[PDB]
Amino acid sequence: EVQLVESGGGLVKPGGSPRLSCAASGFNFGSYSMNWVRQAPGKGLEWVSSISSSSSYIYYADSVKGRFTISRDNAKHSLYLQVNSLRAEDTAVYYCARDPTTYGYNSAWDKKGWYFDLWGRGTLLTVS
Amino acid sequence: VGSSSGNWHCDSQWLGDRVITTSTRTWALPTYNNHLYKQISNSTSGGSSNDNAYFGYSTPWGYFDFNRFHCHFSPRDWQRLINNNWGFRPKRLNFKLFNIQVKEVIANNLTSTVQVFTDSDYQLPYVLGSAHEGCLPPFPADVFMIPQYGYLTLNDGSQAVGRSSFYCLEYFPSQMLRTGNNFQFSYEFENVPFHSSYAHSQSLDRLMNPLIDQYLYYLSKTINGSGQNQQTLKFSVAGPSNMAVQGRNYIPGPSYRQQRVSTTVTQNNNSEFAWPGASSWALNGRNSLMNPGPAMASHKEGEDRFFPLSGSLIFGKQGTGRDNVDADKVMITNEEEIKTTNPVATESYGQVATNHQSAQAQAQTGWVQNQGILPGMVWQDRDVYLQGPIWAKIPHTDGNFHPSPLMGGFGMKHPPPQILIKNTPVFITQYSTGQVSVEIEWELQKENSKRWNPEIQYTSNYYKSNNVEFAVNTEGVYSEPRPIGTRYLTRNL
Amino acid sequence: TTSTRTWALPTYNNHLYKQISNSTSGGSSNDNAYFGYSTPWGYFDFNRFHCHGFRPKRLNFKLFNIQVKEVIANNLTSTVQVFTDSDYQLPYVLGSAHEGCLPPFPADVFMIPQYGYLTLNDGSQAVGRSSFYCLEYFPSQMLRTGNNFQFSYEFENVPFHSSYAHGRNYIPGPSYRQQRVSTTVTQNNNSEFAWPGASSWALNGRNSLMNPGPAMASHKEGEDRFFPLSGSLIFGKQGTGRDNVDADKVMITNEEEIKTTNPVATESYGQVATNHQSAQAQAQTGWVQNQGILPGMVWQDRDVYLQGPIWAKIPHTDGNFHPSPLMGGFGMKHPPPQILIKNTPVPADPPTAFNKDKLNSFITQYSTGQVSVEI
Amino acid sequence: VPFHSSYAHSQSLDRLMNPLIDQYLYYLSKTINGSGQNQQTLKFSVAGPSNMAVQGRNYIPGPSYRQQRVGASSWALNGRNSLMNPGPAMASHKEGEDRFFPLSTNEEEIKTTNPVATESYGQVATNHQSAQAQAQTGWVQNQGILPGMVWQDRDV
Amino acid sequence: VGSSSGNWHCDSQWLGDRVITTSTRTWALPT
Amino acid sequence: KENSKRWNPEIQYTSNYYKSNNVEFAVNTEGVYSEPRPIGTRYLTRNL
Amino acid sequence: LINNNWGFRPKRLNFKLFNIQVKIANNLTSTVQVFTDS
Amino acid sequence: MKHPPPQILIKNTPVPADPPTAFNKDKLNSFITQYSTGQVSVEI
Amino acid sequence: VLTQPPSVSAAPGQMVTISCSGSSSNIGNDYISWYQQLPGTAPKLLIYDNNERPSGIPDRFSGSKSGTSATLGITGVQTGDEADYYCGTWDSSLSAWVFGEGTKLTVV
């Protein structure tokens, strides 16, 4: 049915550049807002970045801002997170999250009202 | 040749109960259709459908359009209006066309003229009420291009009919302007009702005194209980405890059902229902979509995600494409404010008995999908927006009901006249630029309200951002980030 | 006409404003949900015909012979506050056909009703658009025992109420069908259809009964034993109970005089064609259970009764059609103003050291006096 | 009294637009990409000259009561049925077919502002769609007055 | 004694560049 | 009076639409009036 | 006031004291003393 | 000074180049390359 | 910032109430959603739009938002319901999505 698979994770030395690809299958990847959520080992999960359906709206968390780039491909049904200047704090499990609601961008001006109805299994990324 | 024929006037003067807005823009008028009148029809575009059929003519004339509220109001002036006032309406109009500069492809042509006239007898087809593009820009530093004038008339398929009328615009008298001449004219708006820029603080069904019983009775029980021959007539009195059954004087406004579409795409049915599930009306064999249609609430309380299929006005954002744009590009307006006196767009009006009950017959009730006018209805007209149109022309007909237009604004039998402009043929490659100033005097209705607690106001977002709203970005592009409705302050029902 | 009555105005809510919602009343259901406020103020209601073609013209209201009792002795220094809402800035409760009307028989003494109003709600809760009105924030006249109060009102022009009985050019008025109910119980169906079978209209996801509804003939000619389920004004007889009183405890009014210009409430309006006939299909029809306005329609309003309401207020809206109220009477955008009244609270002995709290201990008090209203 | 109007409109109610210009209004053009499970989306497009059926309009045609195309349409008064004659003013027949007439001369000059007598006024949704339930409509066989309507009276 | 020495005035008149706020209250003064 | 030529709209003091058990600056079920928050006077803007 | 204005300031002050009631039973002839410090 | 000598703002009125000849919604971005000159006298 | 109690513990069949306090910019302003995460699995949505419940989610879980705080209430607690709970919303001041600190539910 509907699934999200995250690959690209592995063990990389600090300063190395990796690329996390999220492949979607079972639905129309073109009409949904996509997200990256990471969870550091034994700690609460953290939101990282988001990209719109047309990839015109892109948001980043402050911790990852400026060193992480998020891109989306609609033809290949794939979501991309490029990583630069990896730091020890970047060890986590990277979850690919899907947001069904488009309401933040067309019906509400004051508030986004997002929620994540579909989650990827996640790919581990370790810096050593 | 060396003297200016007009100055640059942009401001707003807020005086007492009236508003005076002035706007000056720079324009460019190219030579449309190589100074020719060409018949157009769906056949020229291929004529794929009977619903899309059309017949008409395209003319070399251009025309000035300032039928959108943004041409006369800045975002601050519109905020100043909608927060402080219960109503407004246009009174006077003044138009000026000056600083004519003719070019030839690039050098100046000093001896060329520009023909301009107004139709004050309304003898031409009035195209200014159809919410077309080509309006004077929201932002004063934008130089805009004048839209071409064309009209339609009776058609059968792509073919014409004998009754079809043909209009030559060179058959009107028109003023001719060289580089030193200027054109100006004044217009008096006919008397129209104030737009109601307020939201009711009461609902039509709650108008009662909650502390007191009525003296009217309703039928509480038709049976004593379980058993045979249990029929009875038991009349409880209507009171605070049950407010649904009380007798009422006034009933909600009319409805025409629309389909509800959720903004969460996962919720929507997996089928193509954009046209097949749409509400429409049919005229002479052609089915026109009902857009936006009668004024009805967009959604029920607690359901802002859904919107009526065609029942809302949907604008675009800056740089949005013409065809099949993504859902984050559009701006959808909700008409929830009228939810107190008006039925929901996506809900039925109510129920009616479909039979006579008897000992052998159970009571049957069918749903009312559309309900026309009934004595004792009350309703609210659609709201007007900063991006939306101002006036419409009331079609000249034997009869109408509540002529107020369905896209919002002021229905007028004699609206502001069309302003036609073209370059004089000399052909030599030629275009002209210049200035346009339009000034409207508005009337205001102040609020005397005794409400104790503070109102809802339109306010700029408090938080930081890369850009500030209603302003240019780093490239110099001006963008209106959101629609702004007029209804914030409240009244009693 | 001229009326004079004796009123007794008590203290309501202990001189206090109270938020009231269905949650205070037990929570009810969604259709009965409400949010509002109850006020210490009382108000006068002469809106019924028994208190006093034809139509009103002028109005004169007098309030005099003020007397205030402490609980019983006379307090001659007490005041009674009264004001009229001539700008219609308060919610208008006089058009809902409530109780508290001055008694028809002139020798009776009536208890003035308490003023309350409703506002917007999502439930027992309120929204940000819900408005709170403080009646103390209006200028009002203060009267001791010797003072009197008097204001005159000019009815805005309304049409005469018409009281009389009466290919084609004109056609009958609109209809919204009502369920039929026999006065003989064994004829009705043996099931509970009081609410399930009724005609309703929906507003913001709530369903209100259609009562009394559009003006329609109560029954066809020859059948007097039937009355529309929500289509008639039902009055209780003198001494009738509040809940589940039998059919001989009430009075069911009938509109049958308007049968000439108006369709029957129980019958359909008519039939329309539902298809195109052809060699392959017969002509098909369907019933019209409800009909809006059509060009050529004529209709009569609902009749007025000695126990019926006189006027109603037309809501302030962009548009309305034939504003005459459906319960009967004269629809007016500026009807006779509400007259609000309360006793000024008199505090009991306050503490002898300053306590910043408001004073919750008052002298038990009520006022009596005289009302006279001329039309 | 108002002057009786004695002219035929050269413009249809649905064709008052400037054929050369797009509208700044949008309409929902696509609900699905298609031919697959979970292919759901919202695509919007500019109402324009190429699709003129979806454009926003300020006014809608007059009120109608159906007639059988040539079972009689009727109105009940005091229990007694009565034929509806002539009834509300409506177009006698759709353009191109002159043989048909309403069951109860031709008015065809009014077909610009008025609905055809033997045609339904239009369609209305009868339900809320969902992922479970497809959208449904139903035909309007009679429509009373609505705000924003315009119509012609009957010819003399 | 039996005649009122004043009336109840609370309101706000918003006039041009000026405002007039009137407030009436009920007080109790002990010893 | 506010004379500003500012193009974009102001920050204003506004009531919040979201539903609640009570109305701000209004009585509660018991009859007690309350003031929810401190309201300062500075919303409109001027140049320096 | 605050949304529509750049500034405000008081001008005139008019005070009134009336409907005096001295006290449980009324005391009709008792007086209340009031003065201002100008 | 609370009210110093006012700011005197000046610009050249944009003169657009040849338009597309078919109506385009967007604002015109192509102008004639142009500048102005003159005299200024200030007397205090 | 969304603040939740670090742990909650109740016996099976007992009402459990988990609530995360928020500022005006985030919880007051936006709809809040709740996510429950098992020890070896990715987070799964529990409640969305304050009180709405996704299909496949039991009736026992309920949520409400009052003022600036939203509370998730679980009734008829079961052994299988022991997992991490996070409440998240969009925060306007930060202009980023914020998750609560997390709440470990433990049944004895």
Residue numbers in the entry:
A (entry chain H): 20 to 147
B (entry chain C): 221 to 325, 334 to 654, 670 to 736
C (entry chain A): 241 to 292, 307 to 325, 334 to 428, 475 to 683
D (entry chain B): 420 to 489, 505 to 538, 561 to 612
E (entry chain F): 221 to 251
F (entry chain F): 689 to 736
G (entry chain F): 301 to 323, 334 to 348
H (entry chain D): 640 to 683
List sentences quoted exactly from the publication behind this structure.
As for the 3-fold antibodies, only a single Fab bound to the 2-fold region, in two potential binding modes, resulting in distorted densities during icosahedral averaging. For the sixteen 2-fold binding Fabs, this strategy resulted in maps reconstructed to 2.54–3.56 Å resolution. The epitopes for the sixteen 2-fold Fabs comprise VR-III to -VII, and -IX of the AAV9 capsid. On the aa level, all 2-fold-Fabs contact D532 and Y706. Furthermore, for all the 2-fold Fab-complexes, movements occurred in VR-IX near the 2-fold axis.
A major challenge for the utilization of AAV vectors in the clinic is the presence of pre-existing neutralizing antibodies (NAbs) in a large percentage of the human population. The presence of pre-existing neutralizing antibodies in large portions of the human population poses a significant challenge for AAV-mediated gene therapy, primarily targeting the capsid leading to vector inactivation and loss of treatment efficacy. These complex structures provide unprecedented details of the mAbs binding interfaces, with many antibodies inducing structural perturbations of the capsid upon binding.
